[PDB]
Design a binder for this molecule. Structure first.
Ligand code: XOW
Lengths: 245, 251
């Protein structure tokens, strides 16, 4: 009795945790620009994910050691009573690395912690990573970075979500925050509870691609489009229906 | 006017083309194994895509020059009257390369041909690439390769579909063909016309992950799972509803 309309079970006592690593400054000797606007993203996400029933936990400007500890901590805690896990990175990145305050971190190792091997509590449950990261270029101005981070998948039941794809460009308003996050959170607010999540992520792909970049106050920032992607290795439909309590 | 249930328009006169590049042998001096079973995949796809209304066009064992020509040809023809475009690679691959008969080809350049810049006829229409490619290892046995090809996205309105993800392994029965393709085509046959395509691709992710690899006739082929992925850069729902062909020209 193989079922095509089959959903992940989102009926556990609690929804689960949403981690937000939020990097705005970096160690001088990396020569990486302030991400002015990232707090907008952090707060906006914190709201939308709280409203979907996540225990949200933000961490501003962790060093590597500090970060790996917090995320290892979370992997080893029991998620037995939780629907799913979410993790979000607002930073800079190159290839398969995210930037902590002090140095870069292999994404593989962070996702590697929730691989069913290493985190039994989350085997068979969706593990969403959302990554607003790009190459730091050097009232409310729009700053624009080149795509830099590889749009890798992880393992089974992981959904990797990316602000921008290879070739394209990533925009952040210094007050309103990243385009990706603005539009993501708009969709979460409107449709989070009703829509299948990938269906929604596709709405975000539309919303962001459709942002016009022809008439721009910077001459050199003209014709730099943004197209986000996502790499689903999910095996079922994913809905965030209101939990009864 | 913004609509969350918004679909790609699949009401053009014809559905479109499905290209299938199908590599079974390779130039001696590459030292790459025969992909015995790939014809199973080719025929199975050819059927399922024909049934969805695609003009299917297969190409067995093209050299690089031959391949680039056939695919450039197709990019420059007008797709104005077509719903979408599909392209499929049954070969070996490393990183961002597919293997033609004679040498490797940067995938970026093949997808690059349908980028709205370069192919106006397909701007705003879905461009699906399906890639059954992996590292050649060295009646019906199951052969098993390590994932090798990067699970890259392309541009806007591209859906990149991959037999296997980094770290995992890719299986092909020498008579029944690739696990990915068997399960893909099973789902296409059952659900192709009704279901949203990515919804279906997720069914394939389930079907393939769920294949057991504990009790195996090769000792060393035990505990090598297969998990395929897909990278959607699509912007709307994608359905392959039956086209209304009741006394009308579909050629
Ligand atoms: O997505 C990108 C973004 C970029 F800025 C530059 C290149 C890409 C595409 N490459 C990949 N895409 C998916 C999985 C792995 C890779 C990868 N690993 C090693 C080299 N490529």
């Amino acid at each position: 009795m193989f079922d095509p309309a089959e959903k992940y079970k989102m009926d556990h006592r609690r929804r689960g945790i949403a981690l937000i690593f939020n990097h705005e400054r970096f160690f001088w000797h990396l020569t990486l620009p302030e991400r002015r606007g990232t707090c907008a993203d952090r707060d906006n996400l914190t709201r939308r994910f709280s409203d979907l029933g996540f225990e949200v936990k933000c961490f501003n400007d962790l060093k590597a050691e500090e970060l790996l500890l917090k995320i290892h901590e979370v992997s080893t805690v029991s998620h037995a009573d939780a629907d799913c896990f979410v993790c979000v990175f607002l930073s800079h990145g190159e290839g398969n690395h995210i930037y902590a305050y002090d140095a870069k971190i292999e994404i593989q190792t962070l996702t590697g912690l929730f691989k069913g091997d290493k985190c039994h509590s989350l085997v068979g449950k969706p593990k969403i990573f959302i990554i607003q990261a790009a190459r730091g270029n050097q009232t409310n101005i729009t700053e624009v970075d080149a795509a830099s981070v590889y749009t890798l998948p992880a393992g089974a039941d992981f959904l990797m979500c990316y602000s921008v794809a290879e070739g394209y460009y990533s925009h952040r308003e210094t007050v309103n925050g990243s385009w990706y996050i603005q539009d993501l959170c708009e969709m979460l607010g409107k449709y989070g509870s009703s829509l299948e999540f990938t269906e929604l992520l596709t709405l975000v792909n539309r919303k962001v691609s459709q942002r016009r970049v022809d008439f721009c106050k910077d001459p050199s920032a003209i014709g730099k489009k943004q197209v986000p992607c996502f790499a689903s290795m999910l095996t079922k439909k994913l809905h965030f229906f209101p939990k009864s309590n």
